[PDB]
Amino acid sequence: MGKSEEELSDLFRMFDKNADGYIDLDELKIMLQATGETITEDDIEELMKDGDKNNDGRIDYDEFLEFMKGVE
Ligand SMILES: Oc1ccc(/C=C/c2cc(O)cc(O)c2)cc1
Ligand SMILES: [Ca+2]
Ligand SMILES: [Ca+2]
């Protein structure tokens, strides 16, 4: 996990490559590419499951908090 919502905020606002307020599946798979992201298509949805348990296709800061517990 990060430190608190001070650093967590930038991980959400500065990571949205689409620029709309909510991170989507396309930006998540393109964000971890700098630190790894070398897996199959199911692994892309692995993090999306905890970030978006509804699977609607959009991640908000409220759901971002719930994901930090699964991604650690
Ligand atoms: O919906 C998501 C929200 C956040 C993340 C972040 C993952 C992650 C994990 C790390 O150890 C370092 C990092 O810079 C990013 C992945 C999916
Ligand atoms: Ca987005
Ligand atoms: Ca969602």
Curated annotation (Swiss-Prot):
Modified residues (Phosphoserine): S9
Record-annotated membrane-spanning stretches: none
Residue ranges occupied by any EF-hand domain in the UniProt entry: 3-38, 39-72
Source species, domain of life: Eukaryota
Sites where the protein binds Ca(2+) 3: D52, N54, D56, R58, E63
Sites where the protein binds Ca(2+) 2: D16, N18, D20, Y22, E27
Similarity section: Belongs to the troponin C family.
Its biological purpose: Troponin is the central regulatory protein of striated muscle contraction. Tn consists of three components: Tn-I which is the inhibitor of actomyosin ATPase, Tn-T which contains the binding site for tropomyosin and Tn-C. The binding of calcium to Tn-C abolishes the inhibitory action of Tn on actin filaments.
Clinical note on disease: Cardiomyopathy, dilated, 1Z: A disorder characterized by ventricular dilation and impaired systolic function, resulting in congestive heart failure and arrhythmia. Patients are at risk of premature death. Cardiomyopathy, familial hypertrophic, 13: A hereditary heart disorder characterized by ventricular hypertrophy, which is usually asymmetric and often involves the interventricular septum. The symptoms include dyspnea, syncope, collapse, palpitations, and chest pain. They can be readily provoked by exercise. The disorder has inter- and intrafamilial variability ranging from benign to malignant forms with high risk of cardiac failure and sudden cardiac death.
Note: Cardiac muscle Tn-C can bind 3 calcium ions per molecule. Domain I does not bind calcium.
Protein name, as recorded: Troponin C, slow skeletal and cardiac muscles
